[PDB]
Structures are given as structure tokens and as C-alpha cells.
Amino acid sequence: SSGWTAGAAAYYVGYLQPRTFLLKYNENGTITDAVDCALDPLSETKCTL
Amino acid sequence: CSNLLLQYGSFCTQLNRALTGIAVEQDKNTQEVFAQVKQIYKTPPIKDF
Ligand SMILES: *[C@@H]1O[C@H](CO)[C@@H](O)[C@H](O)[C@H]1NC(C)=O
């Protein structure tokens, strides 16, 4: 309960929410870029257009 | 209903593009009618015509 040293690692937890995204599939079939629609007005315009 | 409508984004983009074209056309019409000359002349103070 005392004789143990901690590790040296880190983690991060998010929280998914229902959101609409734009995704770009490259020539090889992989996703390379995306836009979070409803983040800021500029992304909203990218998403509408 | 919006999630169901997401598959008609092509149609809605087309509609918005058409209406935007109409609006820009109206501005163009007004400019080409009235802004024939870009020198804003002012009438002389005295009226001797
Ligand atoms: C796609 O795959 C080929 C072979 O793996 C590679 O040469 C090419 O660089 C890849 N496309 C891009 C944009 O990297």
C-alpha cells in the first residue's frame, strides 16, 4: 500500500457528442482533413458550401 | 429531420447558389444603371440656366 512507485504515463478523456462533420478522403482512401461544422462561423461556411 | 435531410445537401447547395447569384445580379444591375460616371459632380450654388 506504500511500496510502489508510480508509472510515467498520461491519458486524456473526452466526451463524444452528436455533431455533423465534413471529411476529406485522399487518393489512397485515407482521411486526411476534416471540418467541425458548428464550431465557428468559418467552419460553418466551409460546411454549408 | 435534419439528419434525414443531410443526403440532399447537393440540392440545397444548388438552391443557395442560385439565390446568391440572383442577389449579386441585382447589385450588379443597380451599379451598372446608376454608377455610369464615378465623378460625383455637385450643382453650382447659383441657378442661372
Ligand atoms: C499513396 O500510396 C503510395 C504507395 O504507398 C504512395 O507512393 C503515395 O505517396 C501515397 N499517396 C500520398 C498523397 O502520399
**For ligand 1, what atom is nearest to the CA of residue A28?**
1
A48 has a chain B CB within 8 A of its CB: yes
DSSP reduced 3-state for A29? coil
Give the cell for residue A48: 454549408
- Ranges of beta strands (E only) in A1-49 are 21-25, 31-36
- A33: how many CB neighbours lie within 10 A of its CB? 9
A28 lines ligand 1 (CB under 6 A): yes
Name the β-bridge partners of A31.
Answer: A25
Measured between alpha carbons, how far is residue A34 from residues A5, A30, A43, A47 in Å? Answer: 41, 12, 10, 10
A48:B16 CB<8 A: yes
B6:A49 CB<8 A: no
DSSP reduced 3-state for A33? strand
Give the cell for residue B17: 447558389
CB A21 within 8 A of CB A38: no
Segment (H or E) for A22: strand A21-25
Method: cryo-EM
